[PDB]
Amino acid sequence: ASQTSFSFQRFNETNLILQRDATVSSKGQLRLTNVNDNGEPTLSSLGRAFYSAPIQIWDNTTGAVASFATSFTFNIDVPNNSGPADGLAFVLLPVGSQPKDKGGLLGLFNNYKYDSNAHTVAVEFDTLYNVHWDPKPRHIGIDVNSIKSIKTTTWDFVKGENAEVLITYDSSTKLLVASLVYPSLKTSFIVSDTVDLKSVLPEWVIVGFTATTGITKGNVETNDILSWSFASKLSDGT
Amino acid sequence: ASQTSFSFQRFNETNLILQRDATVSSKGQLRLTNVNDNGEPTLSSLGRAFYSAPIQIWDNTTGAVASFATSFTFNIDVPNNSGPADGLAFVLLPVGSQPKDKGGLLGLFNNYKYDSNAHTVAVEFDTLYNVHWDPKPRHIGIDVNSIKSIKTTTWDFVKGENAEVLITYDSSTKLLVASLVYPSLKTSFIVSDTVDLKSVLPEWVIVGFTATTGITKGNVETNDILSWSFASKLSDGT
Amino acid sequence: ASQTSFSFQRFNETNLILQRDATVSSKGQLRLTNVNEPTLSSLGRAFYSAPIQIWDNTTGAVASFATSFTFNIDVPNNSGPADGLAFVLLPVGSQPKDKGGLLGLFNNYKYDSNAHTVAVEFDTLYNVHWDPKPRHIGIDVNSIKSIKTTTWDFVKGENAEVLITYDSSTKLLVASLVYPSLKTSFIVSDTVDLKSVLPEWVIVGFTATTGITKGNVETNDILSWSFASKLSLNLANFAL
Amino acid sequence: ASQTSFSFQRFNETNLILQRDATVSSKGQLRLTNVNEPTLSSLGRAFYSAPIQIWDNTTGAVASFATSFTFNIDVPNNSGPADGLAFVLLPVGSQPKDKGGLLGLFNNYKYDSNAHTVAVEFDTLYNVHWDPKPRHIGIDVNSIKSIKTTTWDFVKGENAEVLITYDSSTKLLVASLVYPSLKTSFIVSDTVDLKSVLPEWVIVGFTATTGITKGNVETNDILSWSFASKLSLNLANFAL
Ligand SMILES: CC(=O)N[C@H]1[C@H](O[C@H]2[C@@H](O)[C@H](O)[C@@H](CO)O[C@@H]2O)O[C@H](CO)[C@@H](O[C@@H]2O[C@H](CO)[C@H](O)[C@H](O)[C@H]2O)[C@@H]1O
Ligand SMILES: CC(=O)N[C@H]1[C@H](O[C@H]2[C@@H](O)[C@H](O)[C@@H](CO)O[C@@H]2O)O[C@H](CO)[C@@H](O[C@@H]2O[C@H](CO)[C@H](O)[C@H](O)[C@H]2O)[C@@H]1O
Ligand SMILES: CC(=O)N[C@H]1[C@H](O[C@H]2[C@@H](O)[C@H](O)[C@@H](CO)O[C@@H]2O)O[C@H](CO)[C@@H](O)[C@@H]1O
Ligand SMILES: CC(=O)N[C@H]1[C@H](O[C@H]2[C@@H](O)[C@H](O)[C@@H](CO)O[C@@H]2O)O[C@H](CO)[C@@H](O)[C@@H]1O
Ligand SMILES: *[C@@H]1O[C@H](CO)[C@@H](O)[C@H](O)[C@H]1NC(C)=O
Ligand SMILES: *[C@@H]1O[C@H](CO)[C@@H](O)[C@H](O)[C@H]1NC(C)=O
Ligand SMILES: *[C@@H]1O[C@H](CO)[C@@H](O)[C@H](O)[C@H]1NC(C)=O
Ligand SMILES: *[C@@H]1O[C@H](CO)[C@@H](O)[C@H](O)[C@H]1NC(C)=O
Ligand SMILES: [Ca+2]
Ligand SMILES: [Ca+2]
Ligand SMILES: [Ca+2]
Ligand SMILES: [Ca+2]
Ligand SMILES: [Mn+2]
Ligand SMILES: [Mn+2]
Ligand SMILES: [Mn+2]
Ligand SMILES: [Mn+2]
């Protein structure tokens, strides 16, 4: 009924909303967090990037809820003698949303409690164990209004290898499914849970990414998006 | 390579940029020009509406030019004892473009001379003969940087009948083709000419509509867009 | 409940049903009529190998569809063109009928309510007994006498790009042709009731013929073809 | 240079090649194995009627493709499941091989470099001589002994949604299954060199079998199916 789709193999700032440290490089890579002139990622970085047009997720007249899917390739790399931190996430957020706290909160939250007014749904690729809320192994998590994921799966993170993600949402079943594959390693990971978008999100949202680097020396990473495809469909009744 | 598409059967202001008199009605119709509380169109109206995300039309590094296509249904209706004026157009314009002069200039031009800095490509559905530049019969016209169309075809306009338009641009041949059908009348019209987008338009544009009503009593119309689908593709080299 | 699409920039025999003189060249072109220079009295048809459901008697639903194709009709010097080519919807298993001006679709020029034929013709030869005098695009329903035509300013050897669309909500069949090198364009539209003409399942494809009389001959080459159908279209998406 | 896609929410025989016990029910379901309650020693296969080009020897190009489908495997009380179902790519004209645990695709459990078979199996029965002990999703290349498996927590009568993707630029075949009612998900991935296994043109579809021994039986119903391939994919577009 209403349908939107886009697909980019290279990025440009013109059709993106970039926040904080997010940049588009001369190679057309979406570099969510800061990288210095030496090619090295820096500490206490936070950036977010969204598609410039809002996307309708649900309709309060008809009660319809969109189905959507997104795919993207990302590269998280780590300097020798550091470990990675903190990760990146694909997000659906209110129009006008501004960055929240950095580090392990991923620019999405101000603390680690549930916040029913966060209006945040995200799929996180978390590279740093945060003792107060995370499982110990690195993980893909489904986040609904909290940094404490409603569901996670173990992610065997490998630095500098391109990761291909597919996230799908089927509004008939309310199932959100996230998967990651490393084509060069032939490894694959998947997590799934139900999410009630209509109870969490505004009718219109912005879609895109958030990422942070570690705040403590020895915990840092690049957070580069290399390609992105999104599609959504919302029924109108004809 | 870069791809964008969207399709709406009903409209909402959230993902549109609306200028001047353009509104979205409670029925989700995009009403480009003013209609009063009696359902009657008013004189000296001008409105424009665009998709909120800019669209890349060409790339100055690779030299690639997008191919695109758009379809839409419109309804132009006229009160008894008036004739129609002035028409509507599908447009590609610079990001940030503001309305120009009203009436026969369609909110796109300031006079009827060629302006090499207008950066305007439009397909017009012109319901009012303007003696200084138009063919006498109502017409579909291809407009490049001037209200004086580079090419026109006769359009047998009928008030209040839904018109379905398809406009296509093939960057390999540079051919722009515009067609209109009235499904209820079984009539159809087509016009085609080449346009060099790279020489006329900026690399990024906004896509959408402009419309005006007559400035003189007895020349007035509604200019309602009822549905709109757009798709573009720009090669990146992989 | 049902969607089908395909698009070919180069052809191969494996997924086509080829009839009579229709060949796939080694350069990937679908040459519907014979080339030894084209020859006389040729008939060729070509279809996609999977049947397409266009309507359903249990639900009443009728498909919307669209097809685009590029064709090249060329003519030898000291000859004129004949007879033309058509895009067709036919019953599963259909066999070629009569040659020449009947385009391989009919036995005679009278209406036949058992032909189960819907076609869009690109007619290069004036047949005194049924055609308009100028060369034409026509919508054919169970007869070689088109229900609707438009004038087509045929030019030999120029690539022609066709778009045909059918909207089941309005019953409107629209056919357009452009010559991108010449910047010329043509369009014809009329309603067709598919429910009452075609069987529930059809084969989609092409038919073409050359003239049976010396001096009236042409090539009938299809260079690319896309098709899409939906049964319970986005024309901006399809056209691209 | 070549694209093909279809999507069915309801099935019909007209555009399918059905083999052995495979039927289309009157409610539009593709029941791959026999239901009198499912019965023993059943084998059924079903294919799309048009051949799909997966690679080309003149250009070297290999297709990328994706397929999604919903299936329901159900089991009678006082019975366990067997033997499973698979999505397959096979040579044009392929005929059913042996029943039971060989899923209608092989004669024995040894590697056969002439089977020209690429399959994704949903294996419901532990075959002592080649399978892992838990029920599994497997990638089969010219053998019933999967090159790669993942554990599948099979649950009877629950709709399962499958996505299979092949990326010709990485050679990676990925297969995932979700049970939306249970919120469970499974994934397996491995590289497959299609060029060296399959002929240039293939038929795509399904195979399924029931157990040959009392107490090991199941239905193998496909409820919907979408396929897309491209030969010179957008997974966000396809999945939707
Ligand atoms: C309490 C905690 O999680 N501490 C980790 C620290 O978190 C930051 C901040 O990112 C987080 O949002 C906030 C929540 O209140 O707490 C702190 O301010 O981040 C550092 C890395 O920058 C972690 O330290 C590293 O942890 C690794 C865990 O595997 C490993 O032990 C490293 O050696 C260590 O430096 C804090 O654990
Ligand atoms: C000169 C001219 O075109 N005049 C028509 C007038 O145009 C406006 C304005 O819209 C236009 O952009 C500008 C260009 O310099 O000129 C004028 O300011 O618009 C009116 C209608 O509002 C036309 O009058 C109507 O024309 C009809 C032509 O078929 C018909 O004659 C009507 O009876 C008449 O009122 C001016 O012709
Ligand atoms: C009567 C007529 O149409 N003559 C033209 C001729 O047509 C052929 C054939 O193509 C037609 O299908 C049948 C229908 O009766 O008639 C003739 O046999 O084709 C010639 C070129 O091949 C034209 O010059 C004739 O005018
Ligand atoms: C040896 C074995 O696998 N036994 C199981 C049996 O398998 C069948 C058949 O399905 C296999 O394809 C062939 C391969 O040699 O062996 C047997 O004939 O299936 C039973 C259920 O039908 C299992 O209980 C046996 O364990
Ligand atoms: C994006 O495109 C614009 C052209 O409008 C150009 O000015 C800008 O430098 C581009 N950015 C990058 C990172 O290439
Ligand atoms: C469009 O949607 C928004 C919901 O954010 C609503 O406030 C607004 O009234 C809608 N406009 C129309 C014309 O329906
Ligand atoms: C069609 O495909 C087969 C390979 O399967 C091959 O023999 C033939 O050359 C192909 N035809 C063309 C025109 O490429
Ligand atoms: C398949 O189509 C034919 C009509 O062409 C019909 O006889 C049959 O009922 C259809 N099958 C189903 C399951 O609808
Ligand atoms: Ca963390
Ligand atoms: Ca005018
Ligand atoms: Ca004729
Ligand atoms: Ca087994
Ligand atoms: Mn986490
Ligand atoms: Mn004009
Ligand atoms: Mn004719
Ligand atoms: Mn197995």
Which stretches of A21-174 are assigned E, i.e. beta strand? 23-24, 30-31, 46-51, 55-56, 67-75, 86-94, 121-126, 139-144, 151-154, 163-170
Q: Does D10 touch chain C (CB under 8 A)?
A: yes
Tally Cβ neighbours within 10 Å of residue A236.
Answer: 15
**Which atom from ligand 5 is nearest to the alpha carbon of A12?**
1
Report the gap between the CA of A235 and the closest CA in chain D (Å): 13
Domain boundaries C1-240, CATH class: mainly beta
Residue B148 to residue A177: CA distance in whole angstroms: 54
For residue A56, the chain B residues in CB contact (below 8 A) are 12, 14-15
B8 in contact with C, Cβ within 8 Å: no
Cα separation, D181 vs D179, whole angstroms: 6
Partnered with residue C178 across adjacent β-strands are: C161, C185
Phi-psi category of A96—alpha, beta or left, where left has phi over 0 and alpha has psi -120 to 50? left
Resolution (A): 1.8
Number of C-beta neighbours around residue B32 at 10 A: 32
D40 close to ligand 4 (CB < 6 Angstrom):
no
Residue C132 makes CB contacts below 8 A (sequence gap 6+) with C126, C149, C151
* Contact flag D239-A181 (C-beta cutoff 8 Å): no
Atom of ligand 2 nearest to the CA of B43: 22
Alpha-carbon distance of A213 to A210, in angstroms, equals 11
| Interface contact C14, partner D, CB < 8 A | yes
Helix (H) or strand (E) segment spanning residue B228: strand B224-234
Instruction: Tally Cβ neighbours within 10 Å of residue B18.
Output: 17
Q: Which residues does B51 contact at the CB level (< 8 Å), separation at least 6?
A: A53, B6, B15, B16, B17, B206, B207, B208, B230
Pairwise CB contact (< 8 Å): D50 & C48: yes
CATH of the structural domain B1-238, one choice from 2.40.50.140, 3.40.50.720, 3.20.20.70, 2.60.120.200? 2.60.120.200
Q: Is A130 exposed, middle or buried (0-12, 13-18, 19+ CB in 10 A)?
A: middle
Q: Which residues surround ligand 16, an ion (CB under 5 A)?
A: D 123, 131, 138
Residues within a 6 A CB radius of ligand 1: A 85-86, 103-105, 128-132, 214-216, 218-219
What distance in Å separates residue A188's CA from the closest CA in chain D?
6
Ligand index nearest the alpha carbon of residue D217? 4
Q: How many CB atoms lie within 10 A of CB B208?
A: 27
**In the 3-class helix/strand/coil scheme, how is chain D assigned residue by residue?**
CEEEEEEECCCCHHHEEEEECCEECCCCCEECCCECCECCCCEEEEEECCCEECECCCCCCECEEEEEEEEECCCCCCCECCEEEEEEEEECCCCCCCCHHHCCCCCCCCCCCCCCCEEEEEECCCCCCCCCCCCEEEEEECCCCCCEEEECCCCCCCCEEEEEEEECCCCEEEEEEEECCCCEEEEEEEECCHHHCCCCEEEEEEEEEECCCCCECCCCEEEEEEEEEEECCCHHHHHC
A100: left (phi over 0), alpha (psi -120 to 50) or beta: beta
How many beta carbons lie within 10 A of that of residue A148, not counting itself?
17
Cα dihedral B158, B159, B160, B166 sign:
positive
Check CB contact under 8 Å for B166 and C234. no
Tally of helices (H runs) and strands (E runs) in chain B:
1, 16
Count of CB pairs separated by less than 8 Å, C with D: 57
D147 touches chain A (CB under 8 A): no
Q: How was this structure determined?
A: X-ray
Nearest to C105 by CA among C143, C48, C76, C61: C143
Angle B40-B43-B46 (CA atoms, 0-180°, nearest 5)? 105
Q: CB contact, 8 Å: B235 with chain C?
A: no
